[PDB]
Amino acid sequence: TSQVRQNYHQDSEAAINRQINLELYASYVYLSMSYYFDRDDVALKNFAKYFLHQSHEEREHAEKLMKLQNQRGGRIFLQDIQKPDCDDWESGLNAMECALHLEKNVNQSLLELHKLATDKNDPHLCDFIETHYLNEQVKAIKELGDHVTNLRKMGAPESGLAEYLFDKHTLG
Amino acid sequence: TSQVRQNYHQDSEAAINRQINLELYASYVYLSMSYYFDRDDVALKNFAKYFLHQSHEEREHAEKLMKLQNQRGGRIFLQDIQKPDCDDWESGLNAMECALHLEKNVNQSLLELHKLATDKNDPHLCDFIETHYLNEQVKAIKELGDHVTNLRKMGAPESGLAEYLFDKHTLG
Amino acid sequence: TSQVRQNYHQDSEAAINRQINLELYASYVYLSMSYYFDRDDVALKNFAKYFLHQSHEEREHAEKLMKLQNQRGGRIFLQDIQKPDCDDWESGLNAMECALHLEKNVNQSLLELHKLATDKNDPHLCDFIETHYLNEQVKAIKELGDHVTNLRKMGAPESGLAEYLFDKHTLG
Amino acid sequence: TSQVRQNYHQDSEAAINRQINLELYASYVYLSMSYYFDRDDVALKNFAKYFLHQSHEEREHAEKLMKLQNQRGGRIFLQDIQKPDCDDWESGLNAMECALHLEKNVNQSLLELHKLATDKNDPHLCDFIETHYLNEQVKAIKELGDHVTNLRKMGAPESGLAEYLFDKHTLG
Amino acid sequence: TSQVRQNYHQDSEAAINRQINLELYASYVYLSMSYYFDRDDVALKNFAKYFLHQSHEEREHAEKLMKLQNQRGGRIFLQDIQKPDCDDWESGLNAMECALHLEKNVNQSLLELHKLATDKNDPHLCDFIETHYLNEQVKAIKELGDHVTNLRKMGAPESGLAEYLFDKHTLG
Amino acid sequence: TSQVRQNYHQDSEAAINRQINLELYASYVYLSMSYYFDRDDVALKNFAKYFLHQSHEEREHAEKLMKLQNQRGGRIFLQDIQKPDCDDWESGLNAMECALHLEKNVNQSLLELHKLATDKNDPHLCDFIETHYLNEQVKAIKELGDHVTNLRKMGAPESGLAEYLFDKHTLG
Ligand SMILES: [Cl-]
Ligand SMILES: [Cl-]
Ligand SMILES: [Cl-]
Ligand SMILES: [Cl-]
Ligand SMILES: [Cl-]
Ligand SMILES: [Cl-]
Ligand SMILES: [Fe+3]
Ligand SMILES: [Fe+3]
Ligand SMILES: [Fe+3]
Ligand SMILES: [Fe+3]
Ligand SMILES: [Fe+3]
Ligand SMILES: [Fe+3]
Ligand SMILES: [Fe+3]
Ligand SMILES: [Fe+3]
Ligand SMILES: [Fe+3]
Ligand SMILES: [Fe+3]
Ligand SMILES: [Fe+3]
Ligand SMILES: [Fe+3]
Ligand SMILES: [Fe+3]
Ligand SMILES: [Fe+3]
Ligand SMILES: [Fe+3]
Ligand SMILES: [Fe+3]
Ligand SMILES: [Fe+3]
Ligand SMILES: [Fe+3]
Ligand SMILES: [Fe+3]
Ligand SMILES: [Fe+3]
Ligand SMILES: [Fe+3]
Ligand SMILES: [Fe+3]
Ligand SMILES: [Fe+3]
Ligand SMILES: [Fe+3]
Ligand SMILES: [Fe+3]
Ligand SMILES: [Fe+3]
Ligand SMILES: [Fe+3]
Ligand SMILES: [Fe+3]
Ligand SMILES: [Fe+3]
Ligand SMILES: [Fe+3]
Ligand SMILES: [Mg+2]
Ligand SMILES: [Mg+2]
Ligand SMILES: [Mg+2]
Ligand SMILES: [Mg+2]
Ligand SMILES: [Mg+2]
Ligand SMILES: [Mg+2]
Ligand SMILES: [Mg+2]
Ligand SMILES: [Mg+2]
Ligand SMILES: [Mg+2]
Ligand SMILES: [Mg+2]
Ligand SMILES: [Mg+2]
Ligand SMILES: [Mg+2]
Ligand SMILES: [Mg+2]
Ligand SMILES: [Mg+2]
Ligand SMILES: [Mg+2]
Ligand SMILES: [Mg+2]
Ligand SMILES: [Mg+2]
Ligand SMILES: [Mg+2]
Ligand SMILES: [Mg+2]
Ligand SMILES: [Mg+2]
Ligand SMILES: [Mg+2]
Ligand SMILES: [Mg+2]
Ligand SMILES: [Mg+2]
Ligand SMILES: [Mg+2]
Ligand SMILES: [Mg+2]
Ligand SMILES: [Mg+2]
Ligand SMILES: [Mg+2]
Ligand SMILES: [Mg+2]
């Protein structure tokens, strides 16, 4: 047992390891999305940059959870990082819709994590999740919803012109 | 009676209190408009910023009238600030059309106020209204008419692309 | 239903709309207070500035709640902003006592909002209220209590000298 | 009763006074530790500096709780600050082990305080404890565990060379 | 026996440990005083700042004596730091009168310490006390007497106005 | 078929996708290593920083291969990123030995990739591998061998002192 461990339930430790994997998975999804828009037959450079930045942010999310695990005296256990569900993301709109669904799924996992931390009376872990994850998620979900809405109203995915102009004006 | 009061008719005092309420009402209309465009299913960020700035300007209008009331020795009497007529503003074009109608209504109130000040031979109040309100109104009405015209010619409200591009190029 | 909405109870949405109205009401109370001290027969310029700044802060409070409503996928619904209970605030001490009572009332509303968010297991909303409102309120209540105490010990409201000197040394 | 007091349970007030005493006690323990390493027969200058800084941080912890007590309208009640359990701390490793045990004890007190604030539905006090104390404690406990581990692996306490080199490279 | 010890009497060593405790006690008295003036029903912010600074100075006094003990090869022995005699300090004037009495008591202890160092022919300890403590005490006693005098002549403690104005002009 | 594709064999395209996975795997190994040294019972902060930087470099390696795939008109196909072979890396020396073995394995894959590009007469791909990977690998392998050698000669893994001092002087 770790000399630093205090009020840190084994179930919370396990849940944190599951969350680490999920954040790394989200990083992988956004990495895949990014280079889809770098294809010569897609060629939306600011979509590509946007998703690559999101990919890097998700890796930071994972790293901060790994730091937390050690801070509390838990032990990191890593799993395979599953490949993303799509190889082909079809359109800027469809990728944004997938990212929205991804972020809502990660949010649900974080909310279940917070419920567990609450049930185990772990206020430090509750505050950690609230402080570093829950509002980040709300902002990410809101931004992706905003993007989806604009692309739809602009005429995407049918209008390749719309995706092009969104790439320049919103993501550029 | 106030030691500063001079040539300030009771009717003018009352009219100034009515104008204070109207300016606060205009501030509220623009506040509502602003956050309509912040909705995830509308998502026109520069419409939102534009109307929020207009909201703040209207509050300044109200404050300067409250200052005038005290400068002249009248007594401020506040009324409820009525909620705006619309919860849903439908489109960027429709919001601009509503703001145009609002500004023309506030202008009419200011012109009636000026007629009263003229009838009561209050040149200080006439100059105050002319100096700080009447040309501000003309410029605001002209700008909103310009915006309405551009949105119409661009294809709004049917073209969500038009509202998007107007948001970036004129309001951005 | 909003594409961004997740774990956001209809009751919380309604409570947030009620809180928006209350913050706008507080802004109106402080606006009224401010210009009372700008009257030529009151003439406490730093009381006036202090309350005007508080008025502007309350509008910011309202705006941040409107932003939150949209972030979470709720829909803003505005109500009339009621006029303040007093036209005449009588003295610097009495205005500070009224502001203290106002802030304690707004605090109670925020604490009921937090209880609801807790009952609905909304940790994001709990953190939002804690982060942006609850300590702001505690600090505001403490500052107003401090001011009330000083004015009382100085001899207010009987001593117009006390209110004058407090205006210069504490609010100036 | 205090004019500022709102939703602040008498039990919480008492618990905050107990925590104030404990933080002052921790300040005293670290003060004692510091000057032990300033002895001519111990002479580890960076151990001494490290613990003196920790001592000053604990006094700041106490002061912020005294500020909180007044912010919420409770009344500070001070008790004797007990002398530390050890006059002689024996070795750099043993002092770090004692500081680790101290911080875990203070953490437990803070977690009991948070449970009480939760039971009394005091979200402001919960947020205060989370924001200013609980992660500070986790970081302090982790750092002391790190230090203990390094000193042990280096060969302390038997190796006076290890304590000397740790003083220069980690604490210097 | 310490390798550095020279001409340092066991009685002086013990007296220095007693003085360390007394300086820490004075630090505690001023800490208590400080937060009394931070109460919402007292609310003299510059009294609070003044006494908090005095508290920090007393801790520095204690630390320099702990340094001296080690410099001379004595061994620090700590005792409980007794809580201050008053929880309620009643008025700015009464707190200043108590601080004056405190400083005169600490001065008497220092003068007895100096007599002992003289009797034991310890010129280094005599010079240390003279250099770092005796004139600091005289200046502190003179300043507190000055403050008491001004508060009395101003009309304190009856005049809450006097304490308020002293807070701004002398302590501000 | 891609409009940009020229002299790019399907076998090379597949090999590049295999290399992408391997570089992401190496990133994961170094991520795991990094946080092993962040454990409170290991606590070698510069080992942790060193491996985290290596992790980030490997992700850059992967990204540049994804860019190459698109530049040449191939299509990225991602696979699961396998978890690292070790959860526990035991010692600084053992982690360096594992990283050395990892880099030699990645080098072998790159050399097989280069042989394939040579056999398919793809000089652009040969130059890409030589320019951006092969000397990076040689330098990485040499540096890790240097580190292993120093740790062994210093007395690792038995000497926890050696690993501590290596952490400060070579990795610090
Ligand atoms: Cl970054
Ligand atoms: Cl402005
Ligand atoms: Cl502001
Ligand atoms: Cl500090
Ligand atoms: Cl200092
Ligand atoms: Cl880089
Ligand atoms: Fe970022
Ligand atoms: Fe994430
Ligand atoms: Fe998808
Ligand atoms: Fe789903
Ligand atoms: Fe995310
Ligand atoms: Fe403007
Ligand atoms: Fe206006
Ligand atoms: Fe309208
Ligand atoms: Fe009309
Ligand atoms: Fe207007
Ligand atoms: Fe402010
Ligand atoms: Fe507010
Ligand atoms: Fe009132
Ligand atoms: Fe009431
Ligand atoms: Fe407020
Ligand atoms: Fe610090
Ligand atoms: Fe502490
Ligand atoms: Fe101990
Ligand atoms: Fe214990
Ligand atoms: Fe501590
Ligand atoms: Fe000083
Ligand atoms: Fe002293
Ligand atoms: Fe006393
Ligand atoms: Fe006495
Ligand atoms: Fe003193
Ligand atoms: Fe590098
Ligand atoms: Fe590589
Ligand atoms: Fe290995
Ligand atoms: Fe092998
Ligand atoms: Fe490598
Ligand atoms: Mg992002
Ligand atoms: Mg375990
Ligand atoms: Mg699979
Ligand atoms: Mg909570
Ligand atoms: Mg936050
Ligand atoms: Mg304008
Ligand atoms: Mg009248
Ligand atoms: Mg109505
Ligand atoms: Mg003009
Ligand atoms: Mg304020
Ligand atoms: Mg609804
Ligand atoms: Mg009414
Ligand atoms: Mg929180
Ligand atoms: Mg906060
Ligand atoms: Mg510290
Ligand atoms: Mg009580
Ligand atoms: Mg005892
Ligand atoms: Mg925090
Ligand atoms: Mg002093
Ligand atoms: Mg002895
Ligand atoms: Mg006692
Ligand atoms: Mg002499
Ligand atoms: Mg001198
Ligand atoms: Mg490298
Ligand atoms: Mg193919
Ligand atoms: Mg496996
Ligand atoms: Mg070449
Ligand atoms: Mg080269």
Author numbering:
A (entry chain A), B (entry chain A), C (entry chain A), D (entry chain A), E (entry chain A), F (entry chain A): 5 to 176
Reproduce passages from the article.
Ferritins play a crucial role in iron homeostasis and detoxification in organisms from all kingdoms of life. They are composed of 24 α-helical subunits arranged around an interior cavity where an iron-containing mineral core can be reversibly stored. The ferroxidase center (FoC), an intrasubunit di-iron site, catalyzes the oxidation of two Fe2+ ions coupled to the two-electron reduction of either molecular oxygen or peroxide. Mitochondrial ferritins are atypical of those found in higher eukaryotes in that they are homopolymers in which all subunits contain both a ferroxidase center and a presumed but undefined core nucleation site.
